[PDB]
Design a protein around this ligand. Structure first.
Ligand SMILES: O=c1[nH]cnc2c1ncn2[C@@H]1O[C@H](COP(=O)(O)O)[C@@H](O)[C@H]1O
Ligand SMILES: O=c1[nH]cnc2c1ncn2[C@@H]1O[C@H](COP(=O)(O)O)[C@@H](O)[C@H]1O
Ligand SMILES: O=c1[nH]cnc2c1ncn2[C@@H]1O[C@H](COP(=O)(O)O)[C@@H](O)[C@H]1O
Ligand SMILES: O=c1[nH]cnc2c1ncn2[C@@H]1O[C@H](COP(=O)(O)O)[C@@H](O)[C@H]1O
Lengths: 473, 473, 473, 473
């Protein structure tokens, strides 16, 4: 049971719009909206969305496994050895948000301060003492972007596993010599850094020039969660505010995906006329180039929706019914929809490119969709006894012996393994990950799906407890 | 009663080193060390310090008022009108950490997300509705460093008030015409931005080329808190670890100040031989150029302590007794003292240049000295009934009317005014400031003075409660 | 009769290697090597080449016209109007080295100091007085690369004409409104700058992703000058020095072109065994990325010549027989061939990327191939009476009336038109072009073809008169 | 007899303004204006000047020797060894335009292509073979400004000699160890690069914060050439055009110097009322910050000429009688004087910051003052037999033996030594220097003094022969 299985099971349910059924529904953890900062929904004037993994939720592990296969094939096509063809995607290995160290070829899980929580070289998990040879302070400077790449997106899940596969393969293949910073094959040296860049390039190529989009749209049922409640919630949002889409995807792909997402024999509610997906949006913008979109952006273009090509020149007209935009910036949205920053709730899945940047650069309010949470929640509640025991050991150790330090590592390992080989997205044991820290700081609201907003009344006030400084308590 | 009065009153006390007297002492709020993240003191191997407002705490308002006078005089000497001479420093106006908007000539107090909490044009406090003309979203992008300057240091306190004085003077002087972005005097236009830069330049000039250091060292009793407990605590720290100084100041000034701070007729404890201030440090480094110091730094030089001039060339030797360093980088410290990042507790007062940068770039542990807290604490505890009422109004309003919104602003104003015209350093009403947010995120420990570490035993474990995500609760 | 017709007529001649026949041959202007700085051939140790328009000389106008057609088609395929399909390449319009002003949509011919010599808007030639509206000083700052693009290469000849075609078409098409900086089509504005970038992009696309290389190699006789004397001269050069190729092209294309250039039923001389083109080179380097190649370059890779793909990793071995390199830098050449800068004669056609950069950055000696010179020479000598008259008018006017100024413009126009609508590559009237100035300053030797070196003995000393300063005369 | 002696001897002459006396005067080489590109004086509308070494010509070697002494003293004051005090300026050593190589501590004289002509380490002149260890190609990349500094100005003459002195002193002082890249003194390493920067800093300090200007203005007769013909020529220029000053100096210094230059008991001609120096200029601009001045410049300020301080704010008014400007850009001049680029003759001494930049960035016409030419001309004409013999040997060697190569070096050395140890400013033997090349390319006119324009009638046409390409001859 993957996280997309949870979402697709909740998706197959019809909406019961009785008030009491909703309030009782939204108290169960899986359909809940979680709150980092209070947010008065009645002050929201525009609801905004990206598409990938928000409106269009890609099924797991099928879609990661497709991306992995096509990326492997691209690497082999450019000259990587045939043995790559024998890899097979394994969803139990990668957790999202790991850091790849291009100097030493390691996947790292770190906390908000760059402290190492997990270190794997290939599939070899390096215990604390042995990491100190390469990380004397058990610490990395994350902002050294020449060395470290943070695998922040669900799209990064195939390459997270692929990088470990590659390191494992070359380490154990007798034609190569392992070195501190890469592999030597006689008179060719492949550094982990250049190997890493080939992987990034091949992922980019699969998405832009390869066949991933084509293979997706030819079996959308296999690859995309479909939920009749999506047009219901969008319709309700449009009753109390304006609705816009700002996606990095092109129009042709967006049009195929969105058409599939709205393809029911009815409109918002069963028994109503079907309406095209564009009618649910006051503003549609593609080729957004986020996060640049939240700074100066690019020139505003107009899509010729008949042909799928951009018209020639910069678009200087007003907002019109049926016009589709390309590029521009977040000021385009605010100007054309007459909204100020905090009037906008932006719903996205990119912790950096959607949430952090719209919050910091524009003062937008934010809803982070976290797909894996639909399954992380289930592990969390089923194994609460593990975590409660860890909390209890932490408190006992503090009151103090070394027998307890070993019990702490044992429980920590046993808890993490329930999530995968790389542990929970949000923590390793009692130590929070960087990703968890970013969620709390930049996502005002978050949830496994934004559909969970359907179970809250129109002017609900999401509430979070105020923060007090230690000396204020 | 200023904050330096509180510190100087606690400084005049001799240390009673009975255990029970200490533990009872450190529970009173004013001598307490406050904890954002747990810190096991027994794992600390090096204690590091800056000098200004940490070891050498400048008395308030005397020292701000001196800096203000010399800066005013510098501006008049370069051609600013004589009326500036009639300004007089007023410590009730500035709170530290305000943002000066060079486009519109405003001082702003903002929260961690750039939301406006207070806006003053000169001494005119702009109420919410009127700020929306210049700030349509009640929001600023703080990282736009061309437009916004964050007055983060206590050294910035004179110019915080001076900028408001200048805006007030030119607005109300009939020889000038007020414009959106500055003042017009016939054929000369003075933008708030260029006016602002003249102020920054004049402050820099007073510190580097003017007479501020000279006037300080000629009346150190007037200008510098002196505490016999300082060499006691340094001596105790050196018993369980290494001790270093890394200051941006030059050697000559450091030597005059530090000599004054250690000028008692005794050493660490009364009755012991006096020892020179240098003997309390395993490594002394001046001209540190923080925050660049925590990146690549500058070349390591050696001070000729007899003449106060740098020797010629780059120093390539080892750590020696009596050598004083200049420049270098934080790696110099770690190499010469054989310490790793988390082995170091760095004690400073610059939330950015000392704490944030040493934490993010090097993984150092941090102690932030906040001088004003010695008085903010007293206001906080004396007027807790105001804040408790505000908390109660917040909770009541949430359960819901507009009569309560006005009561909320009334109590908020009345609470803020107890701290000054710009309110508490840490909040305005129930809304936390950017500065408070930075303290919680980057200062592992903080206190009005680092002397408060004297009241904790050698291997004390400072404890902070673990963070849980909303969905983990 | 185009310039490639002249070269192909001289190419069909067999080489007569009698000494007296050579010396008499090389004195005729068309087979001459022209000398800007003296060069002792006996001190040359390596001869180096690029490929395009040096070894592989593309026939004119056929090859420009192919590039024009494919570029037009690419623009139409992305949404430019169908009328573009009715353009047809016209070799009488463009001269190489014109500057396109992206602000005002003009082609400019300028001297070495940026003075305007010719200005055309579309096909409208702007006379002196009318240019002063947009160019008040009849001057452009060429180094303002955001505004001005210098159409330096023969590959730029199709787009030089295309840009004028486009400006002409949009100016005169009633669906558009002409503006100072571009064209308005209701709510779309196409600036000359963005129009210009679409053209650059489409040329790049034709070369890299389009079908230009494919169409070339499927009719090489139509598109490429073929000369049996090429392997003869290369063989002779290899007898007294080392020979290398450094081309920006990829291996697959280089291999097809070079194979065609050496496809005779014999080797260097008739009656000798044919040898593969690679055996004529001590070092073969592709994907050179000049001019970056003459600075830090890119990583050195090794071509798998069987598959045409780069091997995986950085190549760290030595020079081997049969190895083909990719990327690297000019230091690769000098290291692997044991040559110093002035030991190398580099033979290229890019006045900037081959000649200027290798001369300025590395001290290489230079031979600039100028294909058009094979025809410019013929015009020059046939119409010498026009130029001699202009010289005579210049001297007469100086001794002095306005009747002569008009005669000067008349003769200037009549002389320029013999070369094309944009005049001689080297001058307009008595005023030298920027391109001529760059040739004299950076090309030690130059010629219509490098084959002309065949007619000079092994250790010939090319001689140029010494320069004296005005006060030295 | 220095070059300033020649100028001061010609300065003491009264002007005889009979036409025939002038024409006969201007044909003698020393009072001649030399012409690189033809220039019709009647088309000139504005004459512009810098001050230092153009209007105010500093006497030699007195003024270099003062700058040397003050720079030495500054280095000793910051900790350089006392032995520096025993240096004494020696005008026979430096020639202007040498390149200091901060990697290897050498002064280099190079041609226009970076070929080495002379190499001195300290006072040790390195013969050709021995230079190839550090310069394998006898070549430097001049644009590598991190490594090479081009000592282009007469102000650079003191430090040119000082750098050689320093290298000589440290090489031969037993307290130091010579290394490839600097000097080691136990645990201090002084690289030639950091030594070089200390020298640059100390020169800058002497000019801006030291006592050079003060010592100059207290003995102007000793330090500044004074010529009654200067106000005569300025007055004549103002009769046919506009006159402006654009100097990097501040107003106070400019005012002292210019007042001295115009301090005669008469105005333009003897017997006329004296007029203040400002009345000879339509526009006076100080603090010009050339060469930035010819790009975007700095903000336009207004000088308070009573106090010598800048007024407060940006000046936005028009050109007024008596206003003195500060900063701005070259567009300020062109706007306020209504002149286009080629309408301006700019008279300066900085081959880069005055001539090259005004020519390339703005299309100004240029007059380069070269003070040393007043003496280089005398050496040139007195030793023409040496150069004519060298020319004859060059031609003979070309027709060919090694006995002549040695005679060529002998004559080359003997000719160069007549100019100084670093040879002629314009050449070494028959090889032209970089500086000569820049003069020919960027200075339309040049002369030992601009006063030489006095001997040419109002609308003289300076003439230079047209350039022909080798294939055009
Ligand atoms: O790793 C990447 N390389 C290239 N394209 C990506 C990558 N990750 C996501 N995308 C694209 O991003 C688009 C979704 O953007 P969104 O709707 O703004 O979230 C899809 O077109 C993806 O193909
Ligand atoms: O605003 C400023 N301009 C110039 N110098 C400053 C400023 N603020 C602090 N300083 C200097 O910083 C030094 C203290 O550095 P610390 O001991 O590292 O905290 C003193 O020499 C101050 O004069
Ligand atoms: O305008 C251009 N855009 C893209 N490729 C170009 C352009 N001009 C020349 N090339 C390529 O440059 C190569 C020839 O490089 P060369 O042999 O170093 O002179 C060929 O592969 C051309 O396709
Ligand atoms: O090496 C230098 N360092 C600092 N100032 C210089 C240097 N060289 C020239 N100057 C200054 O340049 C000014 C003359 O500028 P000019 O009149 O524009 O040529 C004088 O004030 C000099 O002191």
């Amino acid at each position: 049971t993957s996280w997309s299985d949870r979402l697709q099971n909740a998706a197959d349910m019809p909406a019961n719009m009785d008030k009491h059924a909703l309030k009782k529904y939204r108290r169960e953890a899986y359909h809940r909206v979680f709150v980092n900062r209070s947010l008065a929904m009645e002050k929201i004037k525009c609801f905004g969305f990206n598409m990938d993994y928000t409106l269009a939720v890609y099924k797991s592990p099928e879609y990661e496994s497709l991306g992995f296969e096509l990326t492997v094939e691209r690497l082999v096509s450019i000259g990587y050895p045939q043995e790559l063809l024998s890899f097979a995607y394994d969803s139990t290995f990668p957790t999202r948000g790991l850091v790849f160290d291009t100097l030493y070829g390691n996947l790292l899980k770190v906390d908000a301060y760059g402290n190492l929580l997990v270190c794997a070289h290939g599939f070899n998990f390096i215990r604390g003492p042995e990491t100190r040879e390469q990380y004397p302070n058990k610490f990395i400077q994350r902002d050294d972007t020449e060395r470290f790449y943070i695998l922040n997106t669900l799209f990064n899940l195939p390459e997270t596993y692929l990088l470990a596969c590659l390191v494992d393969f070359f380490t154990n293949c007798p034609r190569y010599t392992s070195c501190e910073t890469g592999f030597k094959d006689g008179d060719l040296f492949m550094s982990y850094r250049s190997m890493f860049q080939d992987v990034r390039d091949a992922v980019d190529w699969v998405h832009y020039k390869g066949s991933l989009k084509e293979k997706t749209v030819e079996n959308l049922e296999k690859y995309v969660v479909k939920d009749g409640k999506l047009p219901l919630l969008l319709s309700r949002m449009k009753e109390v505010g304006k609705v816009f889409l700002a996606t990095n995807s092109d129009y042709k792909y967006t049009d195929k995906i969105m058409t599939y997402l709205f393809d029911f024999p009815h409109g918002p509610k069963p028994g109503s006329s079907h309406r095209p997906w564009q009618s649910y949006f006051d503003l549609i913008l593609v080729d957004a180039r986020k996060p640049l979109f939240f700074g100066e952006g690019t020139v505003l273009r107009q899509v010729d929706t008949k042909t799928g090509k951009l018209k020639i020149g910069t678009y200087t007209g007003p907002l019109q019914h049926g016009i589709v935009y390309s590029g521009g910036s977040s000021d385009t949205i605010c100007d054309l929809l007459g909204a100020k920053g905090k009037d906008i709730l932006y719903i996205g899945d990119h912790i950096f490119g959607d949430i952090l940047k719209s919050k910091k650069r524009q003062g937008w309010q934010t809803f982070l969709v976290i797909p894996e949470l639909a399954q992380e929640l289930h592990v969390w509640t089923d194994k609460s006894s593990l975590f409660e025991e860890l909390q209890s050991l932490d408190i006992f150790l503090a009151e103090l012996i070394s027998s307890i330090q070993r019990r702490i590592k044992k429980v920590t390992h046993d808890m993490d393994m329930c999530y995968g080989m790389m542990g929970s997205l949000f923590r390793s044991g009692s130590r929070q990950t960087l990703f968890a820290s970013q969620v709390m700081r930049y996502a005002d609201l978050y949830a496994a799906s934004f559909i969970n907003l359907l179970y809250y009344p129109f002017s609900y006030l999401f509430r979070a407890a105020h923060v007090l400084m230690p000396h204020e308590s």
